[PDB]
Design an enzyme around this catalytic site. Structure first.
Site, PDB file in Angstrom:
ATOM      1  N   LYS A 215       0.723  -1.371  -0.077  1.00 24.61           N
ATOM      2  CA  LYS A 215      -0.065  -0.007  -0.042  1.00 24.61           C
ATOM      3  C   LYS A 215       0.811   1.308   0.023  1.00 24.61           C
ATOM      4  O   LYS A 215       1.776   1.297   0.271  1.00 24.61           O
ATOM      5  CB  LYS A 215      -0.984  -0.020   1.098  1.00 24.61           C
ATOM      6  N   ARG A 249      -3.970 -10.167   4.855  1.00 25.02           N
ATOM      7  CA  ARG A 249      -4.136 -10.155   3.417  1.00 25.02           C
ATOM      8  C   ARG A 249      -2.947  -9.768   2.705  1.00 25.02           C
ATOM      9  O   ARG A 249      -2.580  -8.681   2.717  1.00 25.02           O
ATOM     10  CB  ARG A 249      -5.371  -9.538   3.271  1.00 25.02           C
TER      11      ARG A 249
END
Ligand SMILES: CNc1nc(N)[nH]c(=O)c1[N+](=O)[O-]
Ligand SMILES: CNc1nc(N)[nH]c(=O)c1[N+](=O)[O-]
Lengths: 269, 269
Positions: A215, A249
């Protein structure tokens, strides 16, 4: 810590033994198809197999992320993928969708878990779908704005609102998983604050899944592009596990499975 | 947290700004030399330069680890390396030795920090050397046996015995760093327990350096050989930083510097 296992139909996930690894399926569509075309499905199945061989426990499959698509088009993409992965790879599948109808058809196609980035707030009927099929649902923190009075207190309130929508639809406690939504409706600074304070979410009494992989906030800290974020992702996975999360995840299953196994041994999980 | 910086002569290390990365110099000797031969020294200098470019803050240099060597032979190996690295790479150097005379000659050659795997217990005069040159000394936990009554309580007692030897020789508090000795006089299970409880060492009031890189206990957990331990090392570095350590001693500087920078941003260091 947990007096129940996560019941996923033919599969069961123990929440006490190890940190559970959710692998993110790459789901790249073919340009001249709306379909379960061979190239696109075969590539997805190969990727699911590789993540299984490298230590994944769940495979997360979505239909948007890439040509624009309506709901009908999203279902036509995801269903063939769920069907083939579910036949060929013996792991539970999560359906990445905030839409009630997609969830329903995905479960009918073979999905075991609903993974909702809007925490049943975009389409509250998704919790009705969840309750009816008796599947786990992940309720992620998300908002259409970043106007926090107090980040962590507000995240917990927002997540409780999601929990209420699910319970009111008949979702059992054992089928709820929460997620702080790292990288959603947060500044880079707020994503770091959430990481630093992630253990607060444990007061709500549900298992927690953390999604940080590759991210932008990691790019903000290290000044590194997406393909050079393995070490930064790793740090986020390790901190998340130390702060008590039950699932991560991730894109890079080999590397993160190793990190997670080592962390588990150290913390005594 | 710290109201002083580590004074390393021409260099100063701030203990509050970031986790400090100590790079482990590879120091492979030439077989027909006892010497500061070109091949062996040039290889060491190149390696020091690479670790500097990848984010190292200190370079750790030793003379045993490889033909057997006496004290005189150990000095003849390490001095030329310290001289060349100290001229060519602008970072503080730590001398990896438990021997008072090696420490003394290494400092004379240009070393800034004494790194002692026996915590001034093998040769207590090393603390006299440290006090005289007014350099930082790392006192690692180590023992000639694994007979613990209670691992952490015993590690802290043992480390306090090292602190007393140093202070009695005149070492100032600001020049003491401690290290739990992961992988020394410990079973694999004990190395994991020490990791899980590392924050206890902070009660003694000194900065802490953690050395876990590529160690056997990581191999014990992951069943992976030495060259496949980056992810496991990473987990240990992240946990160590979360538990408050100020330094990490590592082989893989690029990867661990990134992990450490991300961890620092998350914990608010
Ligand atoms: C489907 N996507 C996600 N789902 C969950 N539960 N958490 C995430 O962080 C993300 N994510 O970052 O994309
Ligand atoms: C010189 N070697 C070391 N020095 C310190 N201070 N800590 C270590 O773990 C190690 N080590 O593992 O080798």
């Amino acid at each position: 810590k947990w007096d129940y296992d996560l019941r996923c139909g033919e599969y069961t996930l123990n929440l006490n033994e190890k940190t559970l690894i959710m692998g993110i399926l790459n789901v790249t569509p073919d340009s001249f198809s709306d379909g379960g075309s061979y190239n696109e499905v075969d590539a997805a199945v190969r990727h699911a197999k590789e993540m299984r061989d490298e230590g994944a426990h769940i495979i997360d499959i979505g239909g948007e992320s890439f040509a624009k698509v309506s709901v009908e088009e999203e279902i036509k993409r995801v269903v063939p993928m769920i069907q083939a992965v579910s036949k060929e790879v013996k792991l539970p599948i999560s359906i990445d969708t905030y839409k009630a109808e997609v969830a329903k058809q995905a479960i009918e196609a073979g999905a075991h878990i609903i993974n909702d980035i809007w925490g049943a707030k975009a389409e509250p009927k998704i919790a009705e779908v969840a309750a009816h099929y008796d599947v786990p649902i992940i309720l992620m923190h998300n908002r259409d704005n970043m106007n926090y009075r107090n980040l962590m207190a507000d995240m917990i309130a927002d997540l409780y609102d999601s929990i209420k929508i699910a319970k009111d639809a008949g979702v059992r406690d054992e089928n709820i998983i929460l997620d702080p939504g790292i990288g959603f409706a947060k500044t880079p600074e707020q994503n770091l604050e959430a990481m630093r304070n992630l253990e607060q979410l444990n007061v709500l009494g549900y298992p927690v899944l953390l999604g940080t992989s590759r991210k932008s906030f990691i790019g903000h800290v290290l000044d590194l592009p997406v393909e050079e974020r393995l070490e930064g992702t790793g740090a986020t996975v390790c901190l998340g596990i130390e702060k008590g999360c039950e699932f991560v995840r991730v894109h890079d299953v080999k590397e993160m499975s190793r990190m997670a196994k080592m962390m588990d041994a150290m913390i005594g999980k």
